[model samples]
Target: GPLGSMVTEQEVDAIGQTLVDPKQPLQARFRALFTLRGLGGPGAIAWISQAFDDDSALLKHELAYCLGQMQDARAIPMLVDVLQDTRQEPMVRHEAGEALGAIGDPEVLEILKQYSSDPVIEVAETCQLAVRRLEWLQQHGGEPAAGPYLSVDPAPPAEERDVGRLREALLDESRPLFERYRAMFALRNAGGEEAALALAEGLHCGSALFRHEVGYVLGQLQHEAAVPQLAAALARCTENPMVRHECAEALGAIARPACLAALQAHADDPERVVRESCEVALDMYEHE
Candidate 1:
């Protein structure tokens, strides 16, 4: 029989039962969950939903994935319950939140909005993707022609939305360092003079982590004005190898004539990573 030959519900039920068997190898159980998801429909959803409470964390994770594939509204309440349950593992909660969004019930929209600022980066990104999916659905006036996974929309216009909030977040002293770094990254993607200035300022005042992140953002922005600041950051920060490496890379990204002298001067820095970054940056410039 060809792969396309439809199997009886009895075969699917038998395979689904194996997914929850404690004696099954974890790998086999995981594979079974994936197979059931590929055969997604009401029966698959029922079988996978029952496996949601399996003692194996791997099974629980796979069950969440299957629910996302099924995209059934019935899964939303259970997924929301899991997401809001602090007793659940953070990874599971994160997956549940994502599954709820994929299900695309309007009832889950506010819950996802609340998770947009979740402490975990994975959760926040997933929530953002969910919001983007919802926006896409609203704009198109129906479910998308493509499958659930194909529903992600382009980011909200950077200038109209992300830029202002990103600038405020980076500049706000009260914001956490990670939040500031995330904002700088968002700004760099959007690209403008103000974003470049934010990166330069962050490079100056930020801790080693902040400096590395700012350096990375500057590299992405590829702003010529950033070369001098990146050079100064490399010279000033000797305590952290990673920060120095990132600053060197940012200077290389700028690849301005002014960076040549600084790169050569730091070519002998004791930190091997810094020296290696300088060499890479200079090579990148010469090639350009």
Candidate 2:
């Protein structure tokens, strides 16, 4: 135990060298390569980068994970290369994409968008993580350009006033269903406790679409205060599978413990969509 605990840089380097040695025991090589990751410096980066080209898939994957943990942006290009390399295993490529995202350079947002359409779901998830990372950066004012980068319109006019108008229209029941739905979308994007409560009140209007839109907005808001009312509405709206499904989805997105019992009770709802939604909610809740 002392020997294992007392590993020094020289020893780590010596052991890491065996990773590429044909005669080394497989277990020894794996331990050596993995241990080198804890060395934590430029040398570790270099060693991991060298291992990136290792013929062994396991070694490459482990090295990618280590590089990701290192969180060094200098490795982004290399990780991007691995992500785009069809020759690499999908898991490894996905890990590479994650590593690039964890590095969190706004410049990589475009590269992530390119990967968003990747055939593999794991790779697509990585791209989504990258996009979220970019969005977080924009939200914190890391990059002014980053906010509008995802927008389709290069020079779209500001819509803050328009969004406020839509929010007001949603509160007015006289507005048509389509207009109310658009208002829900606007308020969901705007996001606040007031917007969430307004949407929750709209759920009582008896329109399945209104309830579903409210659930969608609450999910986006992640408002725990709205969860109790949402759960009650979910119970009362059993007749509307679409509304029930959306409520389950909102509960999943909120991920509060208070909603878990209700979610589990509805896990086997007669409606296929409701059952699927509850299952999804359970999964998200557990992982959260």
Candidate 3:
């Protein structure tokens, strides 16, 4: 619904100002980020890049995500810088790497390869995935794999159609992250209660990054079956903030009555990222 709305130059400036202002509420900043993402231009990309200087890794990660989703070549340099910045949090940097892959520009392949062995496993894995994505795009004649989902994913959905086999791959800790992601997307593309439930099991996986991605896919699916698991993940105080933050947004995306109480419970979460995510999720719920 945020798309197809004509944004004036003055509005872009105002929203851009709001997004980078530390005084602005985090939820409002997130709203601004998504709005800019919807508007899509060098102007929006510039504003979105400015917010990466903020302290919140969650917000920075989302900024990279929006840039990647926009698929503008202007974003390539900024994302490469983010990927190479060791000071950035692994979650943030990982998203940056994923964003580069999302943009699908072959120009970044060498940089992605250079970071494929990054010290941080998340970043390393993400860069490796990016390299694979570029390879896939090249092999497929510059066309990436398509599925039921509209978003650009880190990996193409595997050819597997059997939910049972996909679930095995999705939950196998021994498997590579990229392969697991393929299974995850495949199940998402399968699109039914069974597939949703299979994907929900991914919430229990060991990697925080993997679980966060599961939350994202579940959000995209918007299947009611995933509500309880997503809520449970959000409720876990000891859970990684990245995973919790993602679960909050996923719940917002689902916007079912069952997701309301969970989002409300975390509205004042001790972690700022989780707290802000719940606030944004609640707003998303109202609109949905």
Give the candidate number with the greatest TM-score: 3
Compute the lDDT of residue 77 as modeled in candidate 2: 71
Candidate 3: tens digits of C-alpha lDDT, residues 224-261: 99999999999998998888999999999999999999
TM-score of candidate 3 on Cα atoms, chains taken together: 0.91
- Arranged by TM-score, best first: 3, 1, 2
Best candidate (score: lDDT) = 3
Question: Estimated TM-score per prediction?
Answer: 0.48, 0.44, 0.91
Alpha-carbon runs more than 4 Å astray in model 1: 1-7, 117-121, 142-288
Off by over 4 Å in 3: 1-8
Each candidate: what lDDT?
A: 0.68, 0.66, 0.90
Candidate 3 backbone collisions, by pair: none
The lDDT of model 1 is: 0.68
Range of the 10 consecutive residues with the lowest summed lDDT in candidate 1: 148-157
Better of 1 and 2 by TM-score: 1
Residue lDDT tens for model 2, 162-255: 5557567776777644455546655665667776776777777755545654776687678887888778766764446556767887898899
